[PDB]
Design a protein around this ligand. Structure first.
Ligand SMILES: CON(C)Cc1ccc(O)c2c1C[C@H]1C[C@H]3[C@H](N(C)C)C(O)=C(C(N)=O)C(=O)[C@@]3(O)C(O)=C1C2=O
Ligand SMILES: [Mg+2]
Ligand SMILES: [Mg+2]
Ligand SMILES: [Mg+2]
Ligand SMILES: [Mg+2]
Ligand SMILES: [Mg+2]
Ligand SMILES: [Mg+2]
Ligand SMILES: [Mg+2]
Ligand SMILES: [Mg+2]
Ligand SMILES: [Mg+2]
Ligand SMILES: [Zn+2]
Lengths: 60, 98, 122, 84, 155, 206
RNA sequence: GGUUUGACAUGGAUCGGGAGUGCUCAGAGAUGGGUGUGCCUCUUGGUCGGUUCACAGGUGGUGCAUGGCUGUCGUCA
RNA sequence: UCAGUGGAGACCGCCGGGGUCAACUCGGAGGAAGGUGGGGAUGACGUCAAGUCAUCAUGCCCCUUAUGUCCAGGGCUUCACGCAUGCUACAAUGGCUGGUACAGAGAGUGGCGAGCCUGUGAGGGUGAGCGAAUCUCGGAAAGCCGGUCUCAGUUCGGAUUGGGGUCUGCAACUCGACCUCAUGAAGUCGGAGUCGCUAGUAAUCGCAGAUCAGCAACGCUGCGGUGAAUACGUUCCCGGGGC
C-alpha cells in the first residue's frame, strides 16, 4: 500500500468510527484477520514458512 | 484444591509439561489428580490461495490449542514454592489458581 | 356496498373480509374484531345489521380507510413532487425511490423491458 | 432515520450561521457543504447553497422543507437520459 | 457406467402393510426428502382405498401396478441419418419402476384437491382399468406395436 | 506455479515451527514484533548468511536463535557486533532480548545457505549453469541424498525469462516422512532479480 | 480548498530548549491564531525545530523485462 | 457416554474357484469395516508470452509548488438496456395458528449477556455470569400433534409505495440494517437452449464463523437434521489415455 495511507491508518483517527485495520506486515487493507493482524497473502506465506505458532494446514 | 491450567499448541510439549509438574509435586509429596484433557480449541482460517481473481482454490489452516488440567489436592507450601519457581518450555503457558 | 365503500365477499370469513378493505390489514382487522367483540370465524352472510354498523362505526372512528387514505397517500406523493426532494424526483421519473439499485432490474417501477438496439460487433 | 431521543442533527456551524443571519437580517445566501444537516424551522425563509459535489446549488428553504435533509435538494448525479 | 453394473440398494418393507411395494411407493412420492409426509400421504391413500372397497389396499395397489406395468417400450436409435424407435422388452424391475413413476406423476396431475386421495383415486381407477396411467401404458404399448418392425435391432 | 511449500506441507508432521510462544491477547502484536525482528535481522545481516531465525518468549522476554553459516560477522570483534545488534533489538522491540548465534554444521547441505550462495554468485555475474553445478556437486560431496536447484528469471541478463534447473539423486516432494529442506533467495542483478529455489533431501525421518 | 525536504523514512551539518499537548478562536475541514503546561543527563546525551543539504513519495507505465504466488489441461497416467 | 494422549485393527492375511502358472479376479468365513472402507491434504515434465507491476518485491521509463501529500463534499450504489450467479416464489407434499420433540460445529471482555421491568415490536432501562467442556450466544428449523384456510391470482406470492419508529455511528439525503401500520405488483411452473448430482449423494431444513461500529450476507467457508430415484449399457455428444 501507499506509505501515506499506512501512516494515516496507524495514527489515531479523528472519529473513532473512521479507523481501519491494514495488514501490519503488508499494508493491505482487504482481508485482514483480527486474531493475528496480517492479511490473506501474509497469513498464507507466513504460516507456510512457520513463523505463526499453532497455525498448520487443515485437512479434516 | 490448587488448579493448574496448561495451554499450548503441541500436545507433546503439553504432555511433557504435565508429566514434569505431576512428578515434581509428587517428589514433594502432595498427591495430585491426574492430568485431565480439556477439549482442544479449534480455530479455522480459509484463505484464497492466489493473490488475485482465483477464489475457487483455497487453503485452510487451524490453530489448535491443547489444554490440560491438574489439581494439587495437598496444600504443601513447599510444592507451592516449587511450582512457582520451576522452568517450563516457552511454547506452553501455566495458570495457577490458588 | 357492505362496508364503508367496499362489499365484503360472501362465504368468506370475517377476519379476512375485513382485510379486503383498503387501509385494513391482518392485524388491523384482528384489532377491529377484538374491539367490536365480534367473532372472526363466522361467514359474512350471517351478519346482523347492528353488529355490522357497530363494526363500521369502530372502523370509521379509529382508522383512515378507503378514499380518505388513498387521497392522503396521493397528497403525500404530490407533496414530495412539489417540494422536489430526491424521493420526489424519483417519483416524477417513475423510478425506485428508496435507494434501490437501478442498474440491473428495478423492474416493478421501470415496467416491462423495452429492449433497445445496441452497437453491433464485427 | 436518526433516533428521536438524539434530536435532529444540525451540523453546528450551519446552525451558528443561520442564527447569525437571523440576528443581523434574514437576507444572505449561506454557502455550506453540509448535505448532512437537518432542516429546522429556525432557518425557514433562508437560502442555502448546498454543495452537490462540484457546485453550491442554492435552495430557498420553505415551510415544508423542515422534515428533510439539506442534501435531499441538491442532486449529485446528472442523467438527462440515455441517447438523446 | 463403463466399469460395470453398480450395486442396487436393497428395498425395505413397509412396517404397516409388510410389503416392499408400499415402501417403493412412498420412496417414489418422497418429495423434498420428507419421508414422514410422503408416507402419511401413502397411508391415507391406502386407507381410503380400503374404505371405498372391502378388498385389501395392498392387493388393490398390486392390481393397479399390474394394470400399469408396460411390457415393451421404444428407445431412440441413431442408425443412419434418421432416428429409429426400437422396441425393447422391459425387465420386471424396470416395469415396476415405470408403473410406480407413472402412477405418482398422474396422481400429481389429477384435478382433485389433496395429493393423498388424488393418489387414492388414481390407484382405484388403475386397478379397475381406467385412468391416465393405464392410458399411457396402452399408448406406449401401441407405439411399440407400431414400431415393432425394428425388433431385429436389439443387441 | 502449482507446488506447495515443502516446509508448510511438512509443518507439524516432520518439521517444526520457527516461533514458540503462547499468547491469546497480544497475539497480533507479538506477531508484528516478530516480523520487525526478522525483517531487521535479514536486512542488516545478509553478509553472515541466515539459515533461520527462531523466536521464543517466556514473559516479556524474547529469545532469538540466529542460525548462521559464518557468525563471525554477527559477533564482530569480542562480541561488539553482537552487543550492538542486541541493543538495536531492544531499541526496536522494547523487551529484554537474549540473543544466541549458532553454526550450521553443513552449510553446503542446508538449502537456505545454498540458495544464498547461488544468488550471490548470480549477482556477481557467474554463469548460472556453472554455479548450479558447483552447488549440486558440493551438496552430494557432503552427502545429501538428493539435490534440486531451479533458477528463474532473466538468466544471463537476457530479455526472455527462463526457468533453468538441475537435479539428481532423489527428491520425493510428495512424501511427508521425507525430510526435505527448502531454501529460496533472490539474486538482485542489474536486470531485475533471479529467483533461486533449492530442495535438499536430507533423508527419511519418522 | 491546502501544502512543497513534503503525510512518512535515514544521514550530516546549524540555531536551540522543549517537544508534545490541554481550553479557546476562525474555518466545510485541512490548517491557522490564541492561552495554559512545559525536557532528562550535563557543560558535552535523548528530543524537536527550522534553513538547507542529501533526499523522500507515486495503487504512475510496461504481467510481452521479471521474482514470488495462482489458475489451467489434470488426480489426467 | 464423552473429552484427548498412546496402542490395537485390514494385509486378498485365511478358505474355495478361476487365472499355464503369475499379477490379479470371483465367492465365502471371521469382523465395526473387505478388496483403495468414506472424505481431505498432496497437483509430475510442461502447456496457455494464461492472471497479478494493485498484496509484496523489482529492471527500465515517466511525475517532482505535482502523477507527491492533507481535507470537506461527491463518486465507486447512475439506467432506454444485455448477460451471468443466486434468493423468494407461483401454493394444499401448502399458508396461518397453538402445543410439543431431536443436533452438530463454532464464537465471546470496547465482547457474549442471562434474569427481571418496560414497549405491539425493533428496542430501551437495570444487569448477574463468563477469558469460558463451567457463563452467554440458545431458539435449532424441517418434523409430529390440535385447530383453521378450501383451489380463489387466494388467508398463495411479498415486490413496490405512503406513515410512524429503533439502533449503530461525528453523520444514515445521495447510500445502512431493522421494527411496526397500511399498500399488495409480476408470478398459474417458464421458448430455443442449458446446469448439478451415483449415497448419507441429490433435494431440502435450519445453525455457526471470517471480515465487521453498523450492514445492503440471498455471498463465502463450515456444521449437523431429514433423505431419495437411477445406472440395461458404451451406439451417439464432450474431455482424456495406450498402441
Ligand atoms: C495485444 O498486444 N499484442 C497484440 C499481443 C500482446 C502483447 C503483450 C501482452 O501482454 C499481451 C498480448 C496479447 C493479449 C491477448 C489476451 C486476450 N485476452 C485479453 C482475452 C486473449 O484472447 C488471450 C486468451 N484467451 O488466451 C490471451 O492470451 C491474452 O490474455 C494475453 O495474454 C495478452 C497479453 O497480455
Ligand atoms: Mg470500518
Ligand atoms: Mg504471463
Ligand atoms: Mg491484464
Ligand atoms: Mg498421493
Ligand atoms: Mg497476457
Ligand atoms: Mg511502480
Ligand atoms: Mg461496485
Ligand atoms: Mg477464547
Ligand atoms: Mg463419481
Ligand atoms: Zn499483507
Amino acid at each position: 500500500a501507499k506509505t501515506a495511507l499506512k501512516v494515516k491508518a496507524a495514527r489515531k483517527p479523528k472519529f473513532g468510527v473512521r479507523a481501519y485495520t491494514r495488514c501490519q506486515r503488508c499494508g493491505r487493507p482487504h482481508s485482514v484477520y483480527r486474531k493475528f493482524g496480517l492479511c490473506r497473502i501474509c497469513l498464507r506465506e507466513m504460516a507456510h514458512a512457520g513463523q505463526l505458532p499453532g497455525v498448520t494446514k487443515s485437512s479434516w | 484444591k490448587i488448579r493448574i491450567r496448561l495451554r499450548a499448541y503441541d500436545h507433546e510439549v503439553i504432555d511433557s509439561s504435565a508429566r514434569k509438574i505431576v512428578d515434581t509435586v509428587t517428589r514433594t509429596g502432595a498427591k495430585v489428580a491426574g492430568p485431565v484433557p480439556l477439549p482442544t480449541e479449534k480455530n479455522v482460517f480459509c484463505v484464497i490461495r492466489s493473490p488475485h481473481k482465483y477464489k475457487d482454490s483455497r487453503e485452510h489452516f487451524e490453530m489448535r490449542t491443547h489444554k490440560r488440567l491438574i489439581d494439587i489436592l495437598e496444600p504443601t507450601p513447599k510444592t507451592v514454592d516449587s511450582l512457582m519457581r520451576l522452568d517450563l518450555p516457552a511454547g506452553v503457558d501455566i495458570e495457577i489458581k490458588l | 356496498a357492505r362496508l364503508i365503500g367496499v362489499d365484503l365477499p360472501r362465504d368468506k370469513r370475517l377476519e379476512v373480509a375485513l382485510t379486503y378493505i383498503y387501509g385494513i390489514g391482518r392485524t388491523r382487522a384482528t384489532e377491529t374484531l377484538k374491539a367490536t367483540g365480534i367473532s372472526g370465524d363466522l361467514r359474512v352472510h350471517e351478519l346482523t345489521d347492528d353488529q355490522l354498523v357497530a363494526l363500521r362505526d369502530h372502523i370509521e372512528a379509529n382508522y383512515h380507510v378507503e378514499g380518505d387514505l388513498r387521497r392522503e397517500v396521493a397528497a403525500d406523493i404530490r407533496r414530495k413532487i412539489e417540494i422536489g426532494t430526491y424521493q420526489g424526483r424519483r417519483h416524477r421519473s417513475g423510478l425506485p425511490v428508496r435507494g434501490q439499485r437501478t442498474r440491473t432490474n428495478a423492474r416493478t417501477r421501470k415496467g416491462k423491458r423495452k429492449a433497445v438496439a445496441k452497437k453491433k460487433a464485427k | 432515520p436518526r433516533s428521536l431521543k438524539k434530536g435532529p442533527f444540525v451540523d453546528e456551524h450551519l446552525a451558528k450561521k443561520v442564527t447569525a443571519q437571523n440576528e443581523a437580517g434574514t437576507h444572505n445566501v449561506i454557502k455550506t457543504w453540509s448535505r448532512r444537516s437537518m432542516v429546522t424551522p429556525d432557518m425557514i425563509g433562508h437560502t442555502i447553497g448546498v454543495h452537490d459535489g462540484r457546485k453550491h446549488v442554492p435552495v430557498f428553504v420553505t415551510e415544508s422543507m423542515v422534515g428533510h435533509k439539506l442534501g435531499e435538494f441538491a442532486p449529485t448525479r446528472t442523467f438527462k437520459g440515455h441517447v438523446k | 457406467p463403463r466399469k460395470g453394473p453398480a450395486p442396487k440398494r436393497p428395498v425395505m418393507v413397509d412396517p404397516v402393510y409388510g410389503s416392499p411395494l408400499v415402501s417403493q411407493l412412498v420412496s417414489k412420492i418422497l418429495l423434498d426428502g420428507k419421508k414422514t409426509v410422503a408416507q402419511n400421504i401413502v397411508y391415507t391413500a391406502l386407507e381410503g382405498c380400503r374404505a371405498k372397497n372391502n378388498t385389501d389396499p395392498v392387493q388393490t395397489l398390486k392390481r393397479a401396478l399390474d394394470n400399469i406395468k408396460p411390457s415393451l417400450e421404444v428407445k431412440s436409435r441413431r442408425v443412419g441419418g434418421a432416428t429409429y424407435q426400437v422396441p425393447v422388452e422391459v425387465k420386471p424391475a424396470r416395469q415396476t419402476t415405470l408403473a410406480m413413476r407413472w402412477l405418482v406423476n398422474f396422481s400429481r396431475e389429477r384435478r382433485e384437491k389433496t395429493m393423498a386421495e388424488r393418489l387414492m383415486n388414481e390407484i382405484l381407477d388403475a386397478s379397475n382399468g381406467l385412468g391416465a396411467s393405464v392410458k399411457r401404458r396402452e399408448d406406449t404399448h401401441k407405439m411399440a406395436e407400431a414400431n415393432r418392425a425394428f425388433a431385429h435391432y436389439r443387441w | 506455479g502449482q507446488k506447495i511449500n515443502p516446509h508448510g506441507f511438512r509443518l507439524g508432521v516432520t518439521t517444526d515451527h520457527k516461533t514458540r510462544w503462547y499468547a491469546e491477547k497480544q497475539y497480533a502484536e507479538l506477531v508484528g514484533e516478530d516480523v520487525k525482528i526478522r525483517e531487521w535481522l535479514h536486512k542488516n545481516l545478509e553478509r553472515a548468511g541466515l539459515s533461520s531465525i527462531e523466536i521464543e518468549r517466556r514473559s516479556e522476554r524474547v529469545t532469538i536463535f540466529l542460525y548462521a553459516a559464518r557468525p563471525g560477522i554477527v559477533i564482530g570483534r569480542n562480541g561488539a557486533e553482537a552487543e550492538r545488534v542486541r541493543g538495536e533489538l531492544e531499541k526496536l522491540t522494547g523487551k529484554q532480548i537474549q540473543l544466541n548465534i549458532l553454526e550450521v554444521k553443513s552449510p553446503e547441505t542446508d538449502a537456505q545457505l545454498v540458495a544464498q550462495g547461488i544468488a550471490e554468485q548470480l549477482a556477481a555475474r557467474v554463469a548460472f549453469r556453472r554455479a548450479m553445478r558447483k552447488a549440486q556437486q558440493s551438496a552430494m560431496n557432503a552427502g545429501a541424498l538428493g539435490i534440486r536447484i531451479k533458477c528463474s528469471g532473466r538468466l544471463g541478463g537476457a530479455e526472455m525469462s527462463r526457468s533453468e534447473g538441475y537435479r539428481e539423486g532423489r527428491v520425493p516432494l510428495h512424501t511427508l516422512r521425507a525430510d526435505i529442506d527448502y531454501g529460496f533467495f533472490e539474486a538482485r542483478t542489474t536486470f531485475g532479480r533471479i529467483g533461486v529455489k533449492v530442495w535438499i533431501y536430507k533423508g527419511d525421518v519418522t
